[PDB]
């Protein structure tokens, strides 16, 4: 997830945390919490609300404080994904390890790297930032012939919002997506503040489709993507050439991208939407746009979900 | 810098939950204490919040947040003034600009050399915000009752004059600024006649 | 004190030369060619020409537009306008205000 | 180019377009506003003019009808045009310096008043309106070409600048070392 | 940062003669291949130009060359929309967004993992680049006859269409693409009456 | 000290400016207008300036004068800014005065030479006789006390 | 890389008293000598200005001030220009930018390879200048009595250029030069009709 400073990160980490669950499957999935760096009362934050919601149950959380040793806070992963891996591959079991804040524990890193009187690299960073970030993001994925997995969300804040730092910069280099929070979303009061056009999921067809998620998981999601595309690309005129400058067709697409961020990507970061209430509400979205304009559904589809 | 991207203020921020961010254009518009509130925050603003609602019997969260909606909607509003002036504009949002206006002067300055205003307690605090607030929307039924927003001003001058003083008086003698409510709500039913 | 140039239908905007407006003819495009250059580099300040005209060479209209003088000025026929002159001004409103205040 | 002098100096460029900006900005909208009433009062002007012309050329029909018409084959008017402003825009104002056939004639000299007044307006509102457009070009071109090119040509200035102090900091030390 | 003024892409490109730059803006336009066609560049093209010429007996290093042309007269018009709208635009310069449009979408765009569209052969290039192009050519010289822009485009929905689904035509069927040539030239012309 | 590159971020102003109280700048674009000594009032600044001023050390209208001449002065470079951006027409009659104002505070005001002595009583009725071109409505920052005794 | 924060430059700043910066800019416009006219001092002016006024029995030190001012309002005028446009600027301004152009191309701007160029003799440089600031401050006049920019401009084609060549002209003809203060004062008033 890359966010930025004062971006609800840690809420909608907490609401991951809790939510996250395996489908059809019973007391074989667990979450991995590391804190890097946090101040106490942020740390207080997610420990409370872990056994707040029962979420402590099944989870076993790495705390790590800001006011700790820098060789602690860059050894705190390497203890969770430690623990991770013993339970997915040697106990069987479906972990998701949560980590955050990963800005902090690069900058750990580079107090350290200047501590060891160590060449700095780019923007003052190490030379093996990438490499370092590897040991770690890599330790994810899953064993043939074994039961269990590691999935990881690393959790970051970009300085200056700027993905073109070295940490959410080397960290995309290596991650397969990213989920990217913005402050447009953010102070429009959308929960939590996704941005899904910049926002991306490398690996999504491995885990949608029928006996996954509804048959209805692949063309919908082009669907919504495009449509929103234009609603936004719609409102970004509006605002350029007035609302003269719109056509009819286009009044839709930005009615539409209204809908889709106060209805379908604000849900409340306490709100637990499983994936059939989500498509659910994806098909309503797409009801309000014509139907001979929804080229990347087929007509199959079409005539069995569209209402 | 004089400006706060200054890595010991970014460092600072990043483990601190309050920040008060002193303007010295204020300062020179005499709004004391000097403290801007659109760049200003505090982290704690909900959970105060929770304490004070419980300690108070009172909705006091949601007066503040109100009170700073005014707040965010006078710098909106005070754009669309100088960019084309204060006659063409909404008797609402003229309103919201005379409610902004009173909890700035009203609420907001505070000399620190005054017997009375140096200090202002929780309870006093409360008061001093409810009049405020409740000049607001007592004046805009009025207007959504077929008032005319210039008319409920000068019919406000005695009250809203009372409601300005709010800060100067003692904490013995609280009652003299609820009692202003009561005198609005009366006041404005006049004017709507 | 300079001229005033008209161009449209003869049963229409013939008994204009009464005044002394210089008032020429055309059909196609072509030919309205040619009398508004005429009448425009003759230093004229105001040309009225018949949306009927002018529609052959929406060209002119829009070169000469963002000039002071001459003022090109849609008229009508006797059965009048094709609503060229109307929108032209409607036009102009969508884009610079982007929002219509009619 | 990544100096320290020339950061500075488009560190002020950043300020005086940021200001600039501003100001045709607000321009841009006084312009518009201004026009709003003008474009309304062109609007129901020519809209009336456009009816009794038609009127007019329509009656001068019927007189035409019923003659040859051998019998219509039958002043030196001229304007004035001096140039006015309306805020920053040159505008011009202009002024005028058998039986049933000439009630068709009388029939079109109404209209030469009204005529001249929908040409001062009409070309008026033509004039702010390409002002707006020149006005909104150079909004533009300082919006989205100008200020982003300085913004993060200043960035990259920054950051260049840091990258060699660490960099001459990093090669001291080494030639403490030796 | 995608910066290339690094020393690997710098030293590379100091040895190598092709360079592919891809692109994330183009990535999140769902653009693929991304490959920025206006940075990216081959020194191979005058070469390969000949060998092509050569062996399909075509003047195809021209077909490149303008369609490259159009490319790039497209990111200058784009700017100028940026700045003046695209409304401003003469009809001959919004054909070129259109044809390029077309370039774009019609042909640079890509898609690998559609069992038709992943692999497209030489013959097949080529019949899908002359149609794009002779588009283009019959719509500019319908210009000069007098023809308006939306009339043109208006009236070739089906056939602009036509184009878009080339992509998908099977190796075997490739008369299907080339015909549209006399299909786009003879829809030009009923518009044209 | 000579700022290197003219840069104020520099180390030696940088670091000077944190332990003294204040600093008096000297810009190149004074110098280059004739404009002597060719100070610039408004990023100078003097730290202590509330304490040497007031009644009994210099007159009354010291502190007052001061902040309405270096509003006024900001108003007036706006101002000549302003005539430039959007131009002649676009200037109020009471810009017009602003930027007429700030151009007699260089040349008259600042502009003294480096051989004029002026005693604090010259200086503060000078700076009344340039608020003198302003109405009297925009000196909002003073006390009408101070202003009907010493407003030319 | 003409970057003068360098430690050379630098040092060597320090304890010489003459600075004659020169530009790339300049240089790639055929400038010469390049000298950068607004980074450029000489902490002899006072002193060298006096022994002028005394040699020359005129009021030379006002004449270089003035010189340095417009050159100086031209560089606050550009840095305007260069992001807003051409537009807006009042009749003033342009006649300053006109005078500066002069200064610049006709007075800075010196041939080295030419035979009369290469070297200016002080009562030359005197009349050289003279000339322009004359031009430039009988204009000014002929603006405050309603004359237009643009008018001045059109009628004063012919005595503008003896100011362009005026840097041509033989060391002993400098007549050729005095006579142009009585032209120009002669066509300027003659505008004025």
Redesign the interface.
Known sequence: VFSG?GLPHKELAAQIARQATVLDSSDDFAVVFAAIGI?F?EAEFFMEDFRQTGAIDRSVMFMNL?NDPAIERIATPRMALTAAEYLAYEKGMHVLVIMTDMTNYAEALREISAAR?E??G???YPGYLYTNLATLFERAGRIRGLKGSVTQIPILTMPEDDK??PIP?LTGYITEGQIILTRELYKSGIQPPIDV??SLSRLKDKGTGAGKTREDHAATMNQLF?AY?QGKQAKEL?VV?????LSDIDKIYAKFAERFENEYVNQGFYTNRTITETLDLGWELLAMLPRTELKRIKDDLLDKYLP | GGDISEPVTQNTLRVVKVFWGLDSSLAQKRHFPSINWIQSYSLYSTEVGRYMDQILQQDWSDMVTEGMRILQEEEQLNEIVRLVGIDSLSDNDRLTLEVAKSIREDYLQQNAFDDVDTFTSREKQFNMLKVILTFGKEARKALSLGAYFNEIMEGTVAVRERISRSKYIPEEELAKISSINEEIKETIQLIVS | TYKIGVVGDKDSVSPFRLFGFDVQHGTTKTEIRKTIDEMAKNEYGVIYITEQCANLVPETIERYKGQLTPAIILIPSHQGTLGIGLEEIQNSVEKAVGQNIL | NPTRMELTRLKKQLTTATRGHKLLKDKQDELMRQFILLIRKNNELRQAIEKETQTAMKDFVLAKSTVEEAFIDEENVSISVVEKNIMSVKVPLMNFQNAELDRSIDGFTQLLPKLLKLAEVEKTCQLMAEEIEKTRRRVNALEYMTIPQLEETIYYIKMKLEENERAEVTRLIKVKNM
């Open positions: 400073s101040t009362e800001a009187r060449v700095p780019r923007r003052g073109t730092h910069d056009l910049p495009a595309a509006a050439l007035g609302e003269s400058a």
